[PDB]
Design a binder for this molecule. Structure first.
Ligand code: HEM
Ligand code: HEM
Lengths: 363, 362
């Protein structure tokens, strides 16, 4: 497939097929003027319609008046749409502007402090996010660079993260990706095909309390560093006991195949799968949509690598919070550290050509 | 997803078609034992033969003794070779160790200071490098991680650079990629099929004065920050005048097609193409093989963006140095800053299964 439709009851980039690459950006708002911000949301929506179809923004990247800057910065000319999706979300800090304080959803809860948190304030929070997913990373970067340019004077970029999953040209669609610890990652997840499970666990409903959010969802982002060089010194048995699945096949202990249902009593009590499973958490179930990262090496020569964890849910209080609380004693905690965090309310979809991002909130 | 052959008279990853992704690492040596360093070069060569064919290193990623760490870290299981190449180079600082002082090639020149340089010493230099290029970033990270692990106690990573997309071409028959300024980059390079031009401008020859380097090359690496706020407010005419080519087609000024030959006298006297062209530099010609990068935000509300510039040449003194000296008046200097630098001697190819990286030096 080459393009993903932009219009719908829901924003694309949640339940639509998982693309190979991510560019995730958090923005802070610099204007106090509600009218100026609405004008920007309409201009951004018009740009997103062009970008997700493989077209340049505005009048184009070349062929305009020579004495004017081009409307599009030009680095995606000649590339394909690449399944680009652009998903916008609103942080709790936006609701302190524009008279919105009584329209913050109760489901957009502030996260508690969790044991072992080491959060960098500069790579946490944000008034707004745009999640750009595509199979070509230059298509994703071009989208973020041009939205930031259109918004200059009204928004600034607070923090940015590049990520990667599978490379689809060489890797079959059905094959579970491996994370940078070398384990299969995504076996037991909500799939975009499971319409009733998305209604139960992912999409906000009208009766949940906040009518503007009907058909939206709630996003938790966590930048999780892995202690790669410590993990690589652990024995094979220590690594498998941390998860409760074997490394080669990814089967649950005492089973033969990856997709065999787990028997939780055969795993160690503090194994990651046993603690995270819905049966250990009162039925709490998440849509995981995260990406691996490798940013470089730190000052000590260690690899700056890990998982940029993204979870979508109907209510932060009944999805991420109870599951992450249950990981207080996870055997995996020896090898990871949460170093960035943010939460966002992801509004409903853009219904047609005349609609715009945030129209249910702003009017 | 196909394999690139590892053995040859030359190392792969130079004339080879340019792959989508880069992971570049520079290492410093921490052992004084020559025999221990030779043992590492042989173990690294054996690992490279496995990794470039899509196999796990050593005894594999699982199914060994439960109480031992796996020989391979496992995150490339089930992936194709993805055109992985692994290219090793030796920095000038290596030749102060192991009694190698008299074997440093004359062509491995230290670079002069250039006007506008702001070089970070921590992300410059290095005793040696490994260039990993592949179409899958996970395959490239797995290769660098496993080499670093094998080298524990003998080498440490000094600095690394990931490139998310290529800004170079050795295949003129395929689409030329764009850099983050929005211009095609790679039109007039050296192609992998141009055997005469590779022998003249890229490969070191026995007669050049350093027999152990015959069939090798010399690498310059420059980390270049781009002033994208400043560039994005420039007019279309300003952008095109900086280069001497139009933005949409990438043709030389006045001409209709990308690959039409430049007419230099129609360009501004400070245009990048006019100053960099071989005819402006006594014939000096380079093989360019760079990649784009973005390392987050700059903490001032903007995306960080740059180009990791890589050039291969027969002699640094006759390749990169004269061309970069001629760029002192380039219109492009308003929009870039060099912030990292390193040079390396890239030895000849691994001839067969009994040969090893660096065997002609050691
Ligand atoms: C670097 C951090 C992490 C790594 C490497 C990791 C790895 C894994 C692996 C290998 C599995 C098993 C295969 C699968 O079903 O996907 C798994 C399952 C799971 N993980 Fe994690 N995980 C991490 C962080 C988290 C966090 C922060 C949460 C939630 C707060 C979470 C929730 C889950 C859930 C819900 C499952 C599925 C359990 C089931 O229903 O069987 N993980 N994870
Ligand atoms: C961020 C930095 C740079 C950018 C954005 C850039 C961009 C370009 C562009 C757009 C072209 C024209 C198309 C092509 O033939 O490749 C070009 C050509 C060229 N560049 Fe650069 N360049 C940069 C740095 C450098 C450096 C540092 C050198 C060498 C010291 C260099 C050497 C060349 C050469 C030799 C040509 C081909 C000229 C010819 O024979 O026609 N460039 N560059």
């Amino acid at each position: 497939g080459s393009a993903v439709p932009f219009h719908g009851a829901h924003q694309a980039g949640i339940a639509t097929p998982v693309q190979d690459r991510l560019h995730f950006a958090a923005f802070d708002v610099t204007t106090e003027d509600r009218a100026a911000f609405v004008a920007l949301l309409k201009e951004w929506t018009a740009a997103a319609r062009r970008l997700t179809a493989g077209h340049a923004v505005g009048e184009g990247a070349y062929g305009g008046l020579p004495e004017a800057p081009p409307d599009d910065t030009g680095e995606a000319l000649g590339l394909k749409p690449s399944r680009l999706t652009l998903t916008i979300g609103f942080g709790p800090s936006l609701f302190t502007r524009f008279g919105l304080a009584d329209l913050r959803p109760e489901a957009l809860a502030d996260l508690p402090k969790f044991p072992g948190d080491n959060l960098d304030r500069a790579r946490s929070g944000g008034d707004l996010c745009v999640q750009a997913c595509a199979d070509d990373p230059q298509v994703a970067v071009h989208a973020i660079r041009n939205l930031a340019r259109i918004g200059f004077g009204k928004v600034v970029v607070r923090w940015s993260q590049l990520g990667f999953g599978k490379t689809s040209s060489t890797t079959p669609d059905k094959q579970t990706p491996r994370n940078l610890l070398g384990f299969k990652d995504g076996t037991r997840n909500i799939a975009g095909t499971e319409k009733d499970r998305l209604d139960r666990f992912v999409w906000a409903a009208e009766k949940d309390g906040t009518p503007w959010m009907t058909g939206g969802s709630y996003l938790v982002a966590r930048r999780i560093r892995m202690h790669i060089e410590t993990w690589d010194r652990a024995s094979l048995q220590e690594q498998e006991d941390v998860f409760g699945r074997d490394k080669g096949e990814g089967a649950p202990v005492g089973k033969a195949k990856e997709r065999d249902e787990p028997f939780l009593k055969a795993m160690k009590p503090d194994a990651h799968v046993r603690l995270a499973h819905p049966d250990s958490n009162g039925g709490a179930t998440l849509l995981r949509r995260g990406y691996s990262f490798t940013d470089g090496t730190d000052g000590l020569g260690r690899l700056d690598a890990g998982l940029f964890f993204l979870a979508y849910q109907r209510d932060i209080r009944t999805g991420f919070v109870p599951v992450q609380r249950n990981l207080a004693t996870d055997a995996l905690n020896e090898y990871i550290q949460h170093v960035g965090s943010a939460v966002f309310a992801v509004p409903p979809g853009v219904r047609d050509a005349d609609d715009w991002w945030g129209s249910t909130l702003f009017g």
